Every structure is written in structure tokens, then in C-alpha cells.
């Protein structure tokens, strides 16, 4: 298991957060429930060597 | 079952007297418990009149048969707390508390609660989510209760016990969770809040 | 002189085995005493668990009977309790008390200084935050490590700002609110914004709060 971030720059909402998985797929998952949960919907990146995902 | 009352209210420098009832209390002996917040209790009067090494003077006990009184001559503001009183079970083999008693004893001047209701917000609503929030602030013991149109509701409830604010005053907040299906099947919703025999609502109604 | 201290962990999951110990300085436990354990849940008051005797006697609260396992240990000079098949019921602050028994009463002197246990199933877990729109404030609902930090405009706003205790819920998550009062004419002109922190899971973030 591997430990993933998060950047939020939404329109209220903006910060960051982590969670831990095996693949980032499964952490996509995560983050998207995350993001729905707090409101958020946006356009998703991922940067694979820093391993953040970030939405906007 | 030991009864005693849920709160009492002095001022500095009188008598206070609090109440414990039941009926096992003349075969076997009371005792009396001090709780100061965020501490372990603390002893403070032995077999229904003794009063242990350390405690001042003015705490002094009674008992009547069936009734024990815990008596405070003189009171100061180092004995705002709870008390509990302990004694036997019916069947005198396992010891008993009662609901405990928050003895207040400042005496600055007595506020009104003020009350904010709050509708859950548009964020947690996409969320297949309601939560309503009840402010209740600048107090000087509150209790409350919930009720949907014309029914009092008693499911779903959280309540916080009041704390202190920056200007001396108490404030407490309670929380109604429900299914936004809940939330838009009823006219309205209503924070009841109880303070000292004065009581102030508040409702709201789905946008 | 006498001085009774608990220990143990501070966190159990449902179905799971709450296990305590209640160390015993400046006296033996072969004293005509009985060690109890006595539990408050927060904002409810004292519930009697049972006694145990230096020789092994042990006493139970029948409503509990089935479940609890007072022992006592004179090699380390403790005695502990262990509860077993936990429920949401048992989140309570557990002290361990001497227990002065005659023939006919039975009362409790010393206390030890309690330690809180906390039944709950859940994971570290970023904190899910809502705007309170107009008094306002934010709404900090399902995160599981305890320690959150709310200030408002950076540490700039201190004027009637007040955060309530958490809360624990049935999900085992906290939940917590932070108000303010504001006049009612700076709606326009300023602009206020909240900001939590949650170290565990590492999350800061900051909510912009709008009447609708």
C-alpha cells in the first residue's frame, strides 16, 4: 500500500488530502467520493511521480 | 432507585440543600460523591452525616429514613459541580448512584438563550444527506427536544453538553440527522430549547 | 500516599475485547479492600461495573454479568478488567476505585483518574466540510481521528468565535460546528472564509460561506 494526495481548487472549497491504497485507480475512486461528498465536481489530473490527483 | 434532582441554583454565601430519595435508604447508609468537571469524583460526605479529612466545614448531611440531604452553609464558587449520592440496590448487594445533580452557584446575571436554527445546506443535500443544527449560546443546564410539525421526534438526536465561551456565558448545540426524504416530508421542523423554566423555538421549512 | 492509576488501550472495535489495568502504588492489594471498576458515559452518570477481593471473590452488576472479568494480579500488584462483545453502550470514562466494605454498606474513597475508551469501527477519514449560510459558521461532519482545528480568516477573527465539542454519532465518525456572530450589515464587504485542519489525515482545506 501506497499513500496518494489530493489538490482541490473548487470554487468554496480549495485544500488538499491524502488516502491510502494499492492502485490509483481504487484511490480515484476514493478522492471521486471525497469530491461528491463535499460538493465538489470538476476536471480531474493526476501527476503519476508526485502520485496527487488534483481537480478544478 | 436513588432520586435526586437534575439541577440547583444558588447564589454565594447561602445554604444549599440537595435531596436524594429512596427506599432502601433507612436499612442501609447514603453516601455523597463531589464531581468536579473533567475529573474523578471526589467524596465528600461518609455513612449519611461523617464528613471525611479535607473538605470544608460547611458540607454537612442528613438523613430523615427514606431521604438524605447534603447540606453546603455558605456557599462559594469552589463548589459549582455535580453531586451524586450512592446507597444500596433493593437487594443490598450491589452499590447504586443516582442521576446526579449540577449544582450551580455563580451569580452573575441570569441570560436568556439565544437560538439559531440552521437548514441543512445545498452541498450536503446532493449528498443524499440532512443534517439540522441547533445553536444555542449566552446562557447561564439547558435541556432540549425536537419536533416535526406536531410530533416530537426522538430519533436521530445528538445533544453536546454546554461549555463554556469567551465571555463567560454557556452555549450548547444539538443535531437532527435525517434522510432528505424526511426532510421534505413534513411541513416543518422545530428546536425546542428549555432553560430554567423559560422556553424559546425555532423552525424550518425545505426551501 | 495511596495512588490508583489505569492503563490500557484507549480504543476498541465493536464485537471487540476492552482490556484494562488499574496499577496500585504506595499500598498491596492483600488490603480488606475491594477493587472496583466504575464507568461514566460522556454526560450520563456513575454506573457501578463490579469488585474484586485479594483472594480471587469477585462481585458482578448482573445487567453485565455475562460479558465482564474483573482479575487480580499481586506478582505487579494491579487487577484488570476486561469486557468482552463491546457495543456503541460502552463508550464511557472507566476509573478504578477502592471500595470500604462492612458487613452491611459499601462506599468508594480513592479514585484513580480515568481513562475514556472509545468504541468505534472506522479509518482515519478527511473531514467533509459545509457551509452554515446566515450568526454563521461551518459544519464539520465524517472524520474519524479525534484532534480538528478551526480557525476563521486565518487567526485574524477571535471576536465571538466559538467551536462546540465533537460529537460521536452512531457511524463512529465526529462531527463538530464553529459559529460566529457578525453584524448584519458587513454582509457585502467582507469576505469570510473558514479553515479546517485535521493532522491525522492531512487535510486542510478552506470553505467560502454564502447565504443562498
Known amino acids: 500500500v501506497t499513500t496518494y494526495k489530493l489538490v482541490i481548487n473548487g470554487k468554496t472549497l480549495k485544500g488538499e488530502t491524502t488516502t491510502k491504497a494499492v492502485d490509483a485507480e481504487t484511490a480515484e475512486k476514493a478522492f471521486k467520493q471525497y469530491a461528491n461528498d463535499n460538493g465538489v465536481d470538476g476536471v480531474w489530473t493526476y501527476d503519476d511521480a508526485t502520485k496527487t490527483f488534483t481537480v478544478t | 432507585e436513588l432520586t435526586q434532582p437534575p439541577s440547583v441554583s444558588v447564589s454565594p454565601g447561602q445554604t444549599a440543600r440537595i435531596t436524594c430519595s429512596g427506599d432502601?435508604?433507612?436499612?442501609?447508609?447514603g453516601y455523597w460523591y463531589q464531581q468536579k468537571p473533567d475529573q474523578a469524583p471526589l467524596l465528600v460526605i461518609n455513612?449519611?452525616?461523617e464528613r471525611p479529612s479535607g473538605i470544608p466545614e460547611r458540607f454537612s448531611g442528613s438523613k430523615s429514613g427514606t431521604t438524605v440531604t447534603l447540606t453546603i452553609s455558605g456557599v462559594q464558587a469552589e463548589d459549582e459541580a455535580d453531586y451524586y449520592c450512592?446507597?444500596?440496590?433493593?437487594?443490598?448487594?450491589?452499590?447504586?448512584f443516582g442521576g446526579g445533580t449540577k449544582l450551580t452557584v455563580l451569580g452573575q446575571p441570569k441570560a436568556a438563550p439565544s437560538v439559531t436554527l440552521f437548514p441543512p445546506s445545498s452541498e450536503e443535500l446532493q449528498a443524499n444527506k440532512a443534517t439540522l443544527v441547533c445553536l444555542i449560546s449566552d446562557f447561564y443546564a439547558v435541556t432540549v427536544a425536537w419536533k416535526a410539525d406536531s410530533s416530537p421526534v426522538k430519533a436521530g438526536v445528538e445533544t453536546t453538553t454546554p461549555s463554556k465561551q469567551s465571555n463567560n456565558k454557556y452555549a450548547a448545540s444539538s443535531y437532527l440527522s435525517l434522510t432528505p426524504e424526511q426532510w421534505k416530508s413534513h411541513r416543518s421542523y422545530s428546536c425546542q430549547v428549555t432553560h430554567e423554566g423559560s422556553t424559546v423555538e425555532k423552525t424550518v421549512a425545505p426551501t | 500516599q495511596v495512588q490508583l492509576q489505569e492503563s490500557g488501550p484507549g480504543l476498541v472495535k465493536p464485537s471487540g475485547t476492552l482490556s484494562l489495568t488499574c496499577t496500585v502504588s504506595?499500598?498491596?492489594?492483600?488490603?480488606?479492600?475491594?477493587w472496583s471498576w466504575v464507568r461514566q458515559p460522556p454526560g450520563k452518570g456513575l454506573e457501578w461495573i463490579g469488585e474484586?477481593?485479594?483472594?480471587?471473590?469477585?462481585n458482578y452488576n448482573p445487567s453485565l454479568k455475562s460479558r465482564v472479568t474483573i482479575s487480580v494480579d499481586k506478582s505487579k500488584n494491579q487487577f484488570s478488567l476486561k469486557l468482552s462483545s463491546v457495543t456503541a453502550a460502552d463508550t464511557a470514562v472507566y476509573y478504578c476505585?477502592?471500595?470500604?466494605?462492612?458487613?452491611?454498606?459499601?462506599?468508594?474513597?480513592?479514585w484513580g483518574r480515568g481513562t475514556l475508551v472509545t468504541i468505534s469501527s472506522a479509518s482515519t477519514k478527511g473531514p467533509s466540510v459545509f457551509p452554515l449560510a446566515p450568526a454563521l459558521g461551518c459544519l464539520v461532519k465524517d472524520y474519524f481521528p479525534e484532534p480538528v482545528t478551526v480557525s476563521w480568516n486565518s487567526g485574524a477573527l477571535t471576536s465571538g468565535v466559538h467551536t462546540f465539542p465533537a460529537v460521536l454519532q452512531s457511524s463512529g465518525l465526529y462531527s463538530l460546528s464553529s459559529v460566529v456572530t457578525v453584524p448584519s450589515s458587513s454582509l457585502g464587504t467582507q469576505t469570510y472564509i473558514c479553515n479546517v485542519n485535521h493532522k491525522p489525515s492531512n487535510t486542510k482545506v478552506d470553505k467560502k460561506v454564502e447565504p443562498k
Open positions: 476505585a477502592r471500595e470500604v466494605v462492612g458487613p452491611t454498606t459499601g462506599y468508594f474513597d480513592l
Open positions: 504506595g499500598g498491596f492489594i492483600s488490603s480488606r479492600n475491594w
Open positions: 474484586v477481593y485479594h483472594t480471587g471473590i469477585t
Open positions: 432502601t435508604l433507612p436499612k442501609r447508609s
Open positions: 455513612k449519611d452525616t
Open positions: 450512592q446507597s444500596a440496590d433493593s437487594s443490598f448487594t450491589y452499590p447504586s
